């Protein structure tokens, strides 16, 4: 029985072309270029999903450092004091507190200062 290849190819062509909407130039019209761009786009998405956590952590660290320096304390000393004090709030909510509730961040800075050792450079 002779079989025509229309439907089987048209299915995947429709899916690939629909997935490539919004692209510029040939990448949104022609199936081959759209498929190449789909490969690249999905690889980029997979890599960026992994890198997004680090990107957001870097942004939170920047905001926390800015807020802490506004309270006359460095980010690293503040983190060490917070770890010593036992407060387990992560950097995401720390940055949220810094942006939204400066009083809570000031209180946390105070408790971190309290928890820090007397001479940070001592061999202890």
């Amino acid at each position: 029985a002779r079989v025509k290849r229309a439907l089987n190819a048209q299915k995947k062509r429709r899916t690939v072309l629909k997935a490539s909407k919004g692209y510029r130039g040939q990448r949104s019209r022609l199936y081959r270029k759209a498929k190449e761009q789909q490969l690249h786009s999905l690889t980029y998405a997979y890599r960026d999903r992994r890198a997004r956590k680090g990107e957001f952590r870097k942004l939170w660290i920047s905001r926390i450092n800015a807020a802490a320096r506004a309270n006359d304390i460095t980010y690293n000393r503040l983190i060490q004091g917070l770890k010593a004090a036992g407060v387990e709030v992560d950097r995401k909510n720390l940055a949220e507190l810094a942006v939204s509730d400066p009083a809570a961040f000031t209180a946390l800075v105070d408790v971190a200062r309290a928890a820090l050792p007397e001479d940070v450079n001592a061999p202890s």
Binding site: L42, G86, V87, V89, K92, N93, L97, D101, A103, A107
Partner: protein, 100 residues
């Protein structure tokens, strides 16, 4: 007043009435759950001592079990002919906070 609640290896800043998506929990919709607290900020004074945090908990009701966005994975390497298609829909629960 609001508190930072730990659940599913993560922490969320919530108050009374907030709806927050949370990693899957073995609870039927409409039930109630109690979760630990990483920090309580009531008005001005901030509760941060470990034992004070242990003495308090956040009670929330499970709204529904849902699924996250569909994620398409197509691993690929040039000059190789190696492809690997894969999909994933993370399971989630929707929690409405009742009080602290």
């Amino acid at each position: 007043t609001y508190a930072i609640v730990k659940t599913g290896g993560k922490q969320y800043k919530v108050a009374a009435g907030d709806v927050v998506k949370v990693e899957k929990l073995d609870s039927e919709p409409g039930a109630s759950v109690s979760l630990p607290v990483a920090l309580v900020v009531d008005g001005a004074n901030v509760t941060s001592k470990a034992d004070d945090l242990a003495k308090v908990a956040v009670t929330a009701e499970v709204l529904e079990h849902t699924k996250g966005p569909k994620i398409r994975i197509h691993k690929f390497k040039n000059k190789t002919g190696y492809h690997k298609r894969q999909g994933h829909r993370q399971q989630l629960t929707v929690l409405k906070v009742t009080g602290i």
